Amino acid sequence: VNAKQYXRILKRRXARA
Amino acid sequence: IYLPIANVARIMKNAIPQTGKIAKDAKECVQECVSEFISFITSEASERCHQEKRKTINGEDILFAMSTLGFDSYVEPLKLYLQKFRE
Amino acid sequence: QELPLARIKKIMKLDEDVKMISAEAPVLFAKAAQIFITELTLRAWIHTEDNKRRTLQRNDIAMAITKFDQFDFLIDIVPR
């Protein structure tokens, strides 16, 4: 993964739900 | 929820050969991508402003989030752009 | 050649964690968006040309997103 982005990607994914 | 299709399209147009073409669904795609970019960076900034118990996301916060998230290349041009504002 | 701040601000306000936004923040996003669109578009065009077309297609953007780790955040937005 993109270490710098991965946390935020998953947080964004969770949010879209 | 999206930036104007016309504005998106103009910026895309300037990036390709003068005789290149762009499908409408490609433009829409870019609209969606741009909104996610803004929301992605904004989310990072909003979390860190809340944790620090600050109520306002400022320009510096956006710049820091961009740095944090690997958009390091954006920071200097954005600083220069903002300085040119403000002047 | 400069974007609408009002729309940028509205997009920011979608996020329920966001409270107040300083005046300059949308300005920064206006420039950032232009940089981003330029780079995303250039990268999509690669796949356009590789496919021997002169028309940039959604498929080219999806493909470009998988080739650049900076675009990982879009993988969900533009399914390959």
Author numbering:
A (entry chain A): 267 to 283
B (entry chain B): 57 to 143
C (entry chain C): 41 to 120
Paper text:
Within the NF‐YA helix, we identified five solvent‐exposed amino acids (Y272, H273, L276, Q280, A283), which were used for crosslink incorporation. This resulted in four stapled helices, two with i,i+7 (macrocycle A and C) and two with i,i+4 (macrocycle B and D) crosslinks, all of which were introduced in two different lengths of the binding motif (16‐mer 5 and 19‐mer 2). ITC measurements also confirm the expected 1:1 binding stoichiometry for peptide and NF‐YB/C. To investigate the binding mode, we co‐crystalized 2‐C in complex with NF‐YB/C, which provided crystals that diffract to 1.8 Å (space group P212121). Superimposition of 2‐C and corresponding residues in PBM shows a good overlap, thus confirming an analogous binding mode (RMSD=0.59 Å). The overlay of 2‐DN, 2‐C, and PBM in their bound state indicates an almost identical peptide conformation. Linear peptide 2 shows a very small helical content (13 %, green), while i,i+7 stapled peptide 2‐C exhibits high α‐helicity (81 %, blue). Compared to peptide 2, both peptides with a fully α‐methylated macrocycle (2‐C and 2‐D) exhibit a reduced entropic penalty while the contributions by binding enthalpy are decreasing. Presumably, the bioactive conformation of the peptide observed in the crystal structures of PBM, 2‐C, and 2‐DN is perturbed by an α‐methyl group at position 272.
